[PDB]
């Protein structure tokens, strides 16, 4: 029922650096066109958290909006001998890559975007762990998102926030405490969040809340060309000026001038938009990003 999932907050840029050959439909993502780094996120049921918060930013959008920094290095070469510095983080993730991707990206332990990358004419294997030369379809021009997540800006300092999980010895690459006894091992889907000045915080339970507002990213605006994405910053506030004429719903017209039959664009409140906060060791905090990933977890017996 939501027709505006492609009208993106931020840059709406769903490409990874070094793969710019689909910039026409990924830079920015908009109503028209296909974008191999973004469209998979909208496949019903594949990315349920993002699809519940689809007017918030993707990982690539948050990277290009300068909310999340890129890891150093920003891509790992899977063909190499020693492998790549990402290998430890990647191997503890259980992932399924569709065919025909050359690249895949994830939010690493430092809260930065890392990626695994194949050479020219090489594709990722199905487990996302190796590269291979298959004689088949052309490769996609973008990068596959490895985690189900969404992002937003935040100034809330998380420098004192740390993973705390009852009875866990290891989760992904995080060893939580000494355990010299016998352990049980499983792949688990674990929620996590990243905060300003924090590392990745894995969590035992996901408890989220959303505060709606009338900030610019709480709206999606479109004009008629075919639909076209429109920059809300052009719309005059009540009592102010702009470069375009706009109109919209009651929430929009509470803050912006609405010119009805002369407007160049229509703006409406984005389902689910607002500040999402997350509960972490009993306290509500404003994260940079929230997501799920599937990682090895070892627990005390």
């Amino acid at each position, epitope marked *: 029922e939501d027709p505006h999932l492609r009208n993106r907050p931020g840059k709406g840029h769903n490409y990874i650096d070094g793969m710019t050959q689909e*910039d*026409a*439909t990924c830079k920015p993502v908009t109503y028209a066109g296909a974008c191999s780094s973004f469209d998979v996120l909208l496949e019903k049921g594949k990315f349920p958290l993002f699809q519940s918060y689809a007017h918030h930013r993707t990982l690539l959008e948050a990277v290009h909006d300068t909310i999340i920094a890129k890891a150093d290095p920003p891509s790992c070469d899977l063909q190499s001998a020693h492998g790549n510095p990402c290998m430890k983080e990647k191997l503890v993730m259980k992932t399924h890559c569709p065919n025909d991707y050359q690249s895949a990206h994830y939010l690493n332990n430092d809260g930065k975007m890392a990626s695994v990358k194949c050479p020219p*004419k090489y594709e990722l294997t199905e487990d996302c762990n190796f590269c291979r030369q298959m004689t088949g379809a052309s490769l996609k021009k973008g990068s596959y998102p490895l985690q189900d997540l969404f992002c937003q800006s935040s100034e809330d300092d998380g420098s004192k926030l740390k993973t705390k999980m009852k009875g866990v010895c290891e989760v992904g690459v995080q060893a939580l405490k000494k355990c010299d006894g016998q352990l049980s091992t499983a792949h688990e889907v674990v929620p996590f969040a990243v905060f300003k000045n924090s590392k990745k915080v894995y969590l035992d339970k996901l408890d989220l809340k959303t505060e709606e507002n009338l900030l610019p990213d709480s709206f999606v605006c479109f004009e008629h060309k075919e639909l076209k994405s429109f920059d809300i910053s052009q719309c005059p506030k009540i009592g102010g000026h702009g470069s375009k004429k706009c109109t919209g719903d009651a929430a929009f017209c509470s803050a912006y001038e609405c010119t009805a039959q002369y407007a160049n664009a229509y703006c409406s409140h984005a389902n689910g938009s607002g500040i999402v906060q997350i509960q972490v060791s009993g306290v509500w905090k404003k994260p940079l990003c929230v997501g799920y990933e599937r990682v090895v977890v070892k627990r005390e017996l």
Partner: antibody, heavy 120, light 108 residues
Framework: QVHLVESGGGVVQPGKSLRLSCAASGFIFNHFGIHWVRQSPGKGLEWVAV????????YFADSVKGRFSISRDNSQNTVYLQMNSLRTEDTAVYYC?????????????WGHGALVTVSS | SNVLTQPPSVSVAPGQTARISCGGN??????VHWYQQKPGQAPVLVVY???GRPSGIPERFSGSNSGGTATLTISRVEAGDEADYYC???????????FGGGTKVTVL
């Protein structure tokens, strides 16, 4: 059905200017870059210019670096190639051509060809 | 810089396959394409992304890039294929592509 119709190709003298026009139909003007590749009389192909899908990147050939400019209009689905200070060797059949991917890609659709004769 | 080298001219009898080469550095890595220009006409793309068949190209035409050399093979050569054939690479490091000199193929 993609069609690339070019015009503005005429007979001009050296030192003066011309403006090549490439109208495009059968696709989305916003999703594809447009190149200009000239072929001299009976010689080989030569890429001359490219304007990006959005016009943020505009690259020129070094033989016309500075003397040539490019622009595009979405309201008209048109690409203009302005050629100031034309030289005799610029005499060629110029083809505007769509590029499939935004950069480092192949040219999938070509135009009929505008003859620019730069004789004195 | 990056330069593409083709044979100046190749001739072949009808029906028999003909092969056109394109040389240069790191052709294994790079993507090589091929255009077919018949005289007095616009160049028509016939090979894209090494092996790659555009819509409207018969099985008689095929592209490849191996060992460091690109190749275009034409089986059951019809006389209506007498034309110029240009290979082209656009490396990621290059802000604009490179066309080969151009093979000039005549039917016998």
């Amino acid at each position: 059905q993609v069609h690339l119709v070019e015009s503005g190709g005429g007979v001009v003298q050296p030192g003066k200017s011309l403006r090549l026009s490439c109208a495009a139909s059968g696709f989305i003007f916003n999703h594809f870059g447009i190149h200009w590749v000239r072929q001299s009389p009976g010689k080989g192909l030569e890429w001359v210019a490219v304007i990006w899908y959005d016009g943020s990147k505009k690259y020129f050939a070094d033989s016309v670096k500075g003397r040539f400019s490019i622009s595009r209009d979405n309201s008209q689905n048109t690409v203009y190639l302005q050629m100031n200070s034309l030289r005799t060797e610029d005499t060629a059949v110029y083809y505007c051509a769509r590029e499939r991917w935004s950069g480092h890609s192949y040219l999938d659709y070509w135009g009929h060809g505008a003859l620019v004769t730069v004789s004195s | 810089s990056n330069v593409l080298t083709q044979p100046p001219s190749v001739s072949v009898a009808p029906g028999q396959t003909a092969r056109i080469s394109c040389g240069g550095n790191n052709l294994e890595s790079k993507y090589v394409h091929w255009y077919q220009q018949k005289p007095g006409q616009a160049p028509v793309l016939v090979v894209y992304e090494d092996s790659g068949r555009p819509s409207g190209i018969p099985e008689r035409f095929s592209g490849s890039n191996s060992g460091g050399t690109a190749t275009l093979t034409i089986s059951r050569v019809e006389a209506g294929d007498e034309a110029d054939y240009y290979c082209q690479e656009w490396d990621t490091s290059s802000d604009y592509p490179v066309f080969g000199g151009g093979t000039k193929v005549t039917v016998l």
